[PDB]
Amino acid sequence: NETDALKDRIENIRPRMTLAAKLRELMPEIDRQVRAGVQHDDIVETLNANGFDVNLNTFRSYLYRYRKKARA
Numbered sequence: 001n002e003t004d005a006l007k008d009r010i011e012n013i014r015p016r017m018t019l020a021a022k023l024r025e026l027m028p029e030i031d032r033q034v035r036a037g038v039q040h041d042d043i044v045e046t047l048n049a050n051g052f053d054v055n056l057n058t059f060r061s062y063l064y065r066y067r068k069k070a071r072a
Contacts, residue, residue, distance in 0.1 A: 023054065027062060028070075031063060040063075043059070044059050
């Protein structure tokens with residue numbers, strides 16, 4: 001009776017937290033390449049082809065947060 005959609009959501013909570021953490025670890029190198037002229041959309045495409053369902057807004061959020069913490 002429990003939908004496979006709710007079941008799948010629950011099953012992927014912890015996997016997604018791990019991916020979120022992996023994405024934060026990538027931010028220093030992403031920031032370097034992106035300020036050198038690599039497009040945000042290009043990195044988002046690579047992420048979306050390899051298990052990270054982030055959109056452009058969410059990607060920029062992580063990038064902005066990395067940058068604030070870095071400047072501090």
